[PDB]
Design a protein around this ligand. Sequence first.
Ligand SMILES: CC1=C(C#C/C(C)=C/C=C/C(C)=C/C=C/C=C(C)/C=C/C=C(\C)C#CC2=C(C)C[C@@H](O)CC2(C)C)C(C)(C)C[C@H](O)C1
Ligand SMILES: CC1=C(C#C/C(C)=C/C=C/C(C)=C/C=C/C=C(C)/C=C/C=C(\C)C#CC2=C(C)C[C@@H](O)CC2(C)C)C(C)(C)C[C@H](O)C1
Ligand SMILES: CC1=C(C#C/C(C)=C/C=C/C(C)=C/C=C/C=C(C)/C=C/C=C(\C)C#CC2=C(C)C[C@@H](O)CC2(C)C)C(C)(C)C[C@H](O)C1
Ligand SMILES: CC1=C(C#C/C(C)=C/C=C/C(C)=C/C=C/C=C(C)/C=C/C=C(\C)C#CC2=C(C)C[C@@H](O)CC2(C)C)C(C)(C)C[C@H](O)C1
Ligand SMILES: CC1=C(C#C/C(C)=C/C=C/C(C)=C/C=C/C=C(C)/C=C/C=C(C)/C=C/C2=C(C)CCCC2(C)C)C(C)(C)C[C@H](O)C1
Ligand SMILES: CC1=C(C#C/C(C)=C/C=C/C(C)=C/C=C/C=C(C)/C=C/C=C(C)/C=C/C2=C(C)CCCC2(C)C)C(C)(C)C[C@H](O)C1
Lengths: 192, 170, 49
Amino acid sequence: LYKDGIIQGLGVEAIPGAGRPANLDGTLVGDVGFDPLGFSNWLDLRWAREAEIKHGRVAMLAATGMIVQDAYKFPGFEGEFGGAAMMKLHNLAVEQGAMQQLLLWLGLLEIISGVPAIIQTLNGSERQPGDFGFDPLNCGANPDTLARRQLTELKNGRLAMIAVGGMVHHYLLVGRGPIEFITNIPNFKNPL
Amino acid sequence: DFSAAVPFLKRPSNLDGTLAGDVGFDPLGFSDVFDLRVLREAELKHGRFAMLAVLGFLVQEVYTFPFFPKMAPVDAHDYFVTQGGGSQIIFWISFVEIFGVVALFELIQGKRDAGDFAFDPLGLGKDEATLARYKVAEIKHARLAMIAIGGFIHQFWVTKQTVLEQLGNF
Amino acid sequence: LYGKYAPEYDGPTFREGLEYVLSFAWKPPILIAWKPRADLDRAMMDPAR
Ligand SMILES: CC1=C(C#C/C(C)=C/C=C/C(C)=C/C=C/C=C(C)/C=C/C=C(\C)C#CC2=C(C)C[C@@H](O)CC2(C)C)C(C)(C)C[C@H](O)C1
Ligand SMILES: CC1=C(C#C/C(C)=C/C=C/C(C)=C/C=C/C=C(C)/C=C/C=C(\C)C#CC2=C(C)C[C@@H](O)CC2(C)C)C(C)(C)C[C@H](O)C1
Ligand SMILES: CC1=C(C#C/C(C)=C/C=C/C(C)=C/C=C/C=C(C)/C=C/C=C(\C)C#CC2=C(C)C[C@@H](O)CC2(C)C)C(C)(C)C[C@H](O)C1
Ligand SMILES: CC1=C(C#C/C(C)=C/C=C/C(C)=C/C=C/C=C(C)/C=C/C=C(\C)C#CC2=C(C)C[C@@H](O)CC2(C)C)C(C)(C)C[C@H](O)C1
Ligand SMILES: CC1=C(C#C/C(C)=C/C=C/C(C)=C/C=C/C=C(C)/C=C/C=C(C)/C=C/C2=C(C)CCCC2(C)C)C(C)(C)C[C@H](O)C1
Ligand SMILES: CC1=C(C#C/C(C)=C/C=C/C(C)=C/C=C/C=C(C)/C=C/C=C(C)/C=C/C2=C(C)CCCC2(C)C)C(C)(C)C[C@H](O)C1
């Protein structure tokens, strides 16, 4: 574990002075020992991290998503969707079917890849939770490069999930898309 | 241990690797639930249907028989369900499929190989090595034609353009 | 072979035979192919697979 006992691991404690959960020992990556509401006892940390990792992945795609969709609309998509972003885009996309095709293909991936893998992991398998083998670029040969990498995938991905939320919530109460939102800092001058 | 086709998934047990075109691809795992020989026969039969269908789709577009009127492939089924021919074709397919049932009963008792009917009328793949390569080529081409026939027909519905036409003008 | 051949017969009765032929529609051999994997269905299917 990258920097075990330093950045992750037993010695660390997010809520120090509070005991590290009973089921939160060292091996799981991204374990600073933070399960305040004690889900660890009731949940399968396996499913848990399948979820965390999966979420963080779809959340990164999604965050970058929104940020880029506000700089460069693909022109064909742009013309069909009329410069509509985030919430409404989903509504209009869901019409052109863009969002319908995406649903079919991601669900097919899930039924082919996701569902079966989880079933195996929970039964018990060599595969780690979230361990699809996907690196065409086998970018990290080293186990060590890869530990730093897993920690970074979890954490970059958590900023991801917190921010996709911010993006969306801000968009509901204030009109602007995320690139737009920072500009026009106050955002209450115009509900846009 | 782990299927080469799906590395994160484990190798499906019944798919040892003896059958042609077996890359351990069975994510949902039907082989574990049913006889692999029956599934192999279904694969070969559907795929042979699809290979013939994919060829005929194009051969009809380039050339429709003069005694019959000229209709795009999909528009023809509705024509011949009345012309009469449709019945003749589906009739003969049923006739051959009754002996297909008999062959399936042989298959259940292990007296016949899956997707095998001793059809090498011209002794093409009579070499052991070749029959293997041909068996691999047959299963791939079948697996491809399964996709191709569906595309051809579904494209016609969404776009009234016999494939050759559509490809010509998108 | 053997020119005229008469094959002695001691099998099922004629009534039983026509009942077998009736069995083609009453219980054909088609769907039994799709019964589950009959050796052991992987009763010891390893949890990993
Ligand atoms: C991380 C992760 C996951 C995931 C995920 C996610 C979130 C994935 C997101 C994927 C994305 C955003 C995919 C976008 C694809 C877009 C395509 C192919 C566009 C096609 C456009 C066409 C054909 C067009 C057009 C046009 C036409 C016809 C008409 C013209 O007038 C207009 C126009 C030119 C526009 C899952 C959930 C599976 C879990 C897994 O654990 C891993
Ligand atoms: C795995 C793998 C590979 C790979 C790969 C891939 C596909 C990698 C993809 C990585 C991605 C998509 C990463 C995205 C991270 C996004 C984050 C952290 C977002 C943060 C948002 C924040 C802080 C915010 C915000 C905001 C909010 C809320 C409101 C806004 O108004 C303002 C603001 C914008 C500030 C490859 C093949 C290359 C190699 C390897 O062989 C295998
Ligand atoms: C993901 C997944 C899997 C899978 C899978 C997949 C992708 C399965 C796909 C299956 C497909 C695509 C099957 C297609 C069959 C097509 C046939 C029989 C066509 C017949 C045409 C005829 C008779 C005709 C005709 C005609 C013609 C040509 C001429 C016209 O004038 C007339 C007419 C219209 C009548 C596996 C296997 C691993 C399992 C796993 O757990 C999950
Ligand atoms: C003679 C003989 C024998 C025999 C035999 C026979 C009769 C053999 C017949 C074999 C045939 C007809 C095989 C056909 C294969 C077709 C394929 C793979 C097509 C793929 C198309 C694709 C992917 C596509 C597409 C497309 C789509 C979907 C959409 C389009 O917009 C675009 C595009 C066009 C690109 C046997 C072996 C039985 C034994 C005997 O001893 C000797
Ligand atoms: C597409 C679509 C829609 C939609 C939508 C979407 C995309 C909705 C997305 C919603 C999401 C991603 C919500 C996230 C909320 C996150 C929160 C509150 C996190 C709080 C974290 C905290 C307090 C952390 C605190 C902490 C901190 C900082 C320090 C450490 C301790 C810790 C406790 C961890 C609709 C609904 C508009 C409908 C439309 O027709 C179609
Ligand atoms: C209705 C009707 C008729 C009819 C009819 C007929 C003849 C209908 C025939 C329909 C067919 C053959 C449809 C095939 C669909 C195939 C699909 C979706 C495959 C997807 C594969 C994928 C995504 C593969 C994915 C993949 C996998 C798993 C592994 C590798 C990676 C990857 C490639 C990504 C008529 C014309 C007779 C008229 C009549 O009145 C009634």
